[PDB]
């Protein structure tokens, strides 16, 4: 069964915080008899930017990936000191130390084996995901193993 | 002669059925069905139909209700019909009041067509059976992500 | 007396979605499919038959809007254009 | 780069007979359903779309003539009128 | 904007498939299919479609040929298609060349629709798939006698 | 399965012989995979007359039925001397002797239990049926138990 839960199209950051609107805004309910609790949300690239860049590791324990979002000056997502934060400026090309907030590891998902989740390099065992907040969606770190609230998993669509 | 016969307004006695399922016994409720029933009934009443409204019917009772609708006399004096359905839907067909994943109680569309054919419903020969169904037919958002 | 006629004739089903998809319904405004269906008969039942009204309903769902669906016109055994003529 | 596109958006099946019946075929003239279909596409394809052409074919089988059958327009998911426009 | 797009004659490259099953290994032959093939091909060529005649294909061959037709590079320069199917048929669907009571070999209509959607045939997005089928679907003569 | 084989509509007698045309005249073949060998042919009353009259028997061993066809003077079908024949004139109201060519017995058929076959009163064990002859259909007596050629059974539709 192709269990799909689309919840992302495109949305910008507000107040130094990354916001994401969903495709549905009226909370329409399905007529299928069974429940449809969401488990992933992946789809994007619908035509406010969302940078992903790959890096090569001399110590390969996972493909190195970056996230950044365009600002007045480009901002990169950061994971310093066991908290979530957005740091500004651009990455210094190839990163020298492996332990950094710039680089992330991508792990394949059980769903269709076409998408990948994101893994912190500065944290070992933590997990980046999203949770329902008010009418929008807020990207907040939460452990994948622990079922925190609904625990919507954050994945991105790969190029064919 | 490309249009259907339409009988006199002052003497015709049309008939339409509006079956909707809102409250179930093992399924989450179909909220908002009340406005649906009200709007559909008002529209058909404006169109010129004697609306019959039923709620929360098991498929077994559903079938005998269809048979009673077919056997009603107004059909000899009508020229069409409407069977608007509103319930949950499995790919097999329409979900009843007592439907469950353990034992299914599903009213197929083929059965609905059979209960209103010329043999079983001789009163509706050369008369349209404009069935309207609002239900699900599978587990898929209905969209796919292809790489343009 | 015993004049013959087709067993199955003059049927036009109209499902909410194509096979193996789902259908949505607003919690208060009512079902989107039924809402569009009743609006299209409120606006077009005097100038388009059931087939073309159903086609207009189908076209109204062409561009997806997140919670997308596609009406289907099953087993269209109709033989002539069917104008409701509400009150002539 | 990525759209939704409504998987199974544009389709029109056209069966020879309704479900649970029989379709005939002349041993030398060719299939009666196919013969009527090609006659109607030779005569009407320049002035009637596929939906109305199939409706004309269906109506041409209305009055039974012994070997009777009834074409069926399954899963009509067309959004717009489809004119073949042969040679134009 | 109620009419599907039609591009230039001199550059469009449509593709229409015509499958027929005339010879069988356990079923009496479908005589007259030759005239059907000739007429269908002539009419489609008049329309402007590069036809593709195939005869006596098993359901597996049916499926692989359908996938090859979907993957053909001429779809990107077209606006429609035709899939004229003419063979024996039962309630389930189309009959293959190797059909038998003991082992069935049926190409369902659902499979034909599935193998031409936007996911499996991305080159045909927003383009009609006008399928034509000539096959039986049951045993009943299709007529009934009712006392009027 | 509602196995139906319609082969009769209406047709008159020619040369003191009962002829019957069929609904199909081009011998169209079904597209169903299985064969469709005919076994009965019943349907009539489509709008050249075919008389059936019921009689009451003081010795009831089957419902008494008559066949007649309108002529210049009405003709009744006859079964005298182990042969098929058409005799002219009208029946003499209630028949006195049970053994006669006028009276026939009707027996219910296994097919839909709505039609009945015809039984000779003058013959015991014989059976009235029809067989394909040239382009038309000819009513010729043939034993039901014996499979003579195709052995199409002759039945008529009863009033509801």
Swiss-Prot record, chains A, F:
The pro-IL-18 precursor is processed by CASP1, CASP4 or CASP5 to yield its mature, active form. The pro-IL-18 precursor features autoinhibitory interactions between the propeptide and the post-cleavage-site region, preventing recognition by the IL18R1 receptor. Processing by CASP1, CASP4 or CASP5 induces conformational changes to generate critical receptor-binding sites. The mature form is then secreted and released in the extracellular milieu by passing through the gasdermin-D (GSDMD) pore. In contrast, cleavage by CASP3 inactivates IL18. This is Interleukin-18. Residues 1-31 form a propeptide. Keywords: Cytokine, Cytoplasm, Inflammatory response, Secreted. Forms a ternary complex with ligand-binding receptor subunit IL18R1 and signaling receptor subunit IL18RAP at the plasma membrane. Mature IL18 first binds to IL18R1 forming a low affinity binary complex, which then interacts with IL18RAP to form a high affinity ternary complex that signals inside the cell. Interacts with cargo receptor TMED10; the interaction mediates the translocation from the cytoplasm into the ERGIC (endoplasmic reticulum-Golgi intermediate compartment) and thereby secretion. Pro-inflammatory cytokine primarily involved in epithelial barrier repair, polarized T-helper 1 (Th1) cell and natural killer (NK) cell immune responses. Upon binding to IL18R1 and IL18RAP, forms a signaling ternary complex which activates NF-kappa-B, triggering synthesis of inflammatory mediators. Synergizes with IL12/interleukin-12 to induce IFNG synthesis from T-helper 1 (Th1) cells and natural killer (NK) cells. The keyword Secreted applies. Changing residue 35 to A: Reduces binding to IL18R1 and the ability to induce IFNG production. Induction: In macrophages, release is increased by endocannabinoid anandamide/AEA. It comes from Homo sapiens (Human). InterPro entries: IL-18, IL-1_fam, IL1/FGF. SUPFAM superfamilies: Cytokine (SSF50353). GO terms for molecular function: cytokine activity; interleukin-18 receptor binding. Changing residue 87 to A: Reduces binding of the preformed binary complex of IL18 and IL18R1 to IL18RAP resulting in impaired IFNG production. GO terms for cellular component: cytosol; extracellular region; extracellular space. Changing residue 39 to A: Reduces binding to IL18R1 and the ability to induce IFNG production. Belongs to the IL-1 family. It comes from the Eukaryota. It is found in: Cytoplasm, Cytosol; Secreted. GO terms for biological process: angiogenesis; cell population proliferation; cell-cell signaling; cellular response to lipopolysaccharide; cholesterol homeostasis; cytokine-mediated signaling pathway; defense response to Gram-positive bacterium; establishment of skin barrier. Changing residue 36 to A: Impairs binding to IL18R1 and the ability to induce IFNG production. The record marks 31-32 as: Cleavage. The keyword Secreted applies. Its main location: cytoplasm. It holds the Pfam family IL1.
UniProtKB/Swiss-Prot annotation, chains B, E:
It comes from the Eukaryota. The active site is at residues 88, 136. Transmembrane segments: none annotated. Changing residue 148 to N: In IDL(uncl); abolished cleavage in the interdomain region. Heterotetramer that consists of two anti-parallel arranged heterodimers, each one formed by a 20 kDa (Caspase-1 subunit p20) and a 10 kDa (Caspase-1 subunit p10) subunit. Can form a heterodimer with isoform epsilon which then has an inhibitory effect. This is Caspase-1 subunit p20. It comes from Homo sapiens (Human).
